[PDB]
Structures are given as C-alpha cells and as structure tokens.
Amino acid sequence: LTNSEKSRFFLADLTGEVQSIPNTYGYISGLGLFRSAPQTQTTFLMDLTDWD
Amino acid sequence: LTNSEKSRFFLADLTGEVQSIPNTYGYISGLGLFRSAPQTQTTFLMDLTDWD
Numbered sequence: 001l002t003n004s005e006k007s008r009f010f011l012a013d014l015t016g017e018v019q020s021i022p023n024t025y026g027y028i029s030g031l032g033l034f035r036s037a038p039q040t041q042t043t044f045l046m047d048l049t050d051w052d
Numbered sequence: 053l054t055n056s057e058k059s060r061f062f063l064a065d066l067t068g069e070v071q072s073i074p075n076t077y078g079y080i081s082g083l084g085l086f087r088s089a090p091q092t093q094t095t096f097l098m099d100l101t102d103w104d
Contacts, residue, residue, distance in 0.1 A: 039065045039067070041053075041056075041063060043064050043065070044066070045066045046066070047070075048070060049070070
C-alpha cells in the first residue's frame, strides 16, 4: 500500500489515521440570553431614569 | 443618533432607556375582604343591641 519505513523497494500498509480536535465549550452562547443589538456608531449611550 | 460626549461634531447612538419603578404591594386590596358601601351623608350611625 505504502513504501516501507527505511527502503523504497518494500511495502507496508497505511492503516487509517487518528486526529485530536481540541476542547471547545458552550452552554453560555447556547442560551438565548444575549440579544443582538446591531448599531452604526463606535459608541452608544443609554438613559437612566427612576422615580419614587 | 445623538451628540457624542467630549465633542459636538461627532455622533453616537442612544440605544434606549431603563426605568426603576418603585415596588408596590396589593395583597390586602386584592383579598377582597372589605366590601364597598357607598354613602350619601358625611357620617353614618349603627345600633348596638345585646342581651345576656
């Protein structure tokens, strides 16, 4: 199947491949808590009001 | 789109406004214990009779 470890005139089969994908976490972006508010300017203001 | 801070010639966003309405309680009023008795005069009387 494939050329041998230390000679080009001998064969040795390649039996597949193994991969190691890193660990990615979620469960915070999974919950629909943060609603997206797209805007146009580089900064935004907000008004605070209250009474008693 | 509103005037940004520090400058009257650039613009920023006013996303919105949050409010702090004071806490109000209505348990007794919602209990319905006190039935309404509308009146015409300014004072009302009552008779107190008892025996032993």
